[model samples]
Target chain A: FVNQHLCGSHLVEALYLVCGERGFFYTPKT
Target chain B: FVNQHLCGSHLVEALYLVCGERGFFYTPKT
Candidate 1:
């Protein structure tokens, strides 16, 4: 299992808020 | 601030294992 610290939970959320979900993850909207 | 519960920590790890990092996120290999 991946550790919480190593996993980028905040990063995903940041992307989600900035752009949106691209399948399971999120990315910039340009 | 983003909460831990809403973030997708497990998904990122699954992608990291299945594929690899693509910038700040991970995606499937083509």
Candidate 2:
């Protein structure tokens, strides 16, 4: 059943990213 | 940046799944 769920089926998906900053500082390779 | 994103260096993520019909059936059979 490798080709199951039918070709024209549908599924809903979403992603959310929250951002905040007082600072996001980094010390890269000192 | 494989392990770079610090643990509490926060980011938000979300996922959604949609299902329909008398479908979404699968075989767990012998």
Candidate 3:
């Protein structure tokens, strides 16, 4: 279902804000 | 911030759907 996709999206968003784009993108294992 | 994408494809649709409306508009958070 799309629920997983939505959850992933929210995770990415939170990471982006908390860690910033580069930091988030460089996350070793998310 | 973006009313949470208005949550999935429906959310995407809601944003685009309201593009022509005047209720509220802002760059999508993403």
Candidate 4:
């Protein structure tokens, strides 16, 4: 089921807030 | 199974970014 997941831009923005430039490694899985 | 969940503050913050001030209802469940 393809639910409305958080878009890439949203994920990137979140990670950037949480980890700055090194935040790309912190990917959330569900 | 209560894992190390993010604090309410984090949830609130995330929802705020995702849905703005009217974001309190976006609760994540595992």
Best-matching candidate per TM-score: 4
Best by lDDT: 4
Error of 3 at A14 (Å): 0.3
Supply the global lDDT for candidate 4.
0.55
Q: On residues A1-30, what C-alpha lDDT tens digit does candidate 4 reach at each position?
A: 112345777666566555544435755688
Residues B1-30, candidate 3, lDDT per residue (tens digit)? 223322445454444433424344445567
lDDT per residue for candidate 2 within A1-30, as digits (tens), equals 122242212211111121223223232343
Candidate 2, residue A5: the lDDT equals 47
TM-score of each: 0.25, 0.16, 0.28, 0.31
Indicate whether candidate 2 or candidate 4 has the larger lDDT. 4
Model 1: which residue pairs collide? none
TM-score result, candidate 4: 0.31
List the candidate numbers ranked by TM-score, top first: 4, 3, 1, 2
True contacts kept of 1: 0.07
Fnat of candidate 4 = 0.00
Error of 2 at B11 (Å): 7.9
Query: Per-model C-alpha lDDT, please?
Result: 0.45, 0.24, 0.44, 0.55
The regions of model 3 sitting more than 4 angstroms off are: A1-6, A25-30, B1-30
For residues A1-30, write the lDDT of model 3, one tens digit per residue: 112232456555554444543464644364
Error of 1 at A9 (Å): 11
Chain A of model 1, TM-score against the native? Answer: 0.39
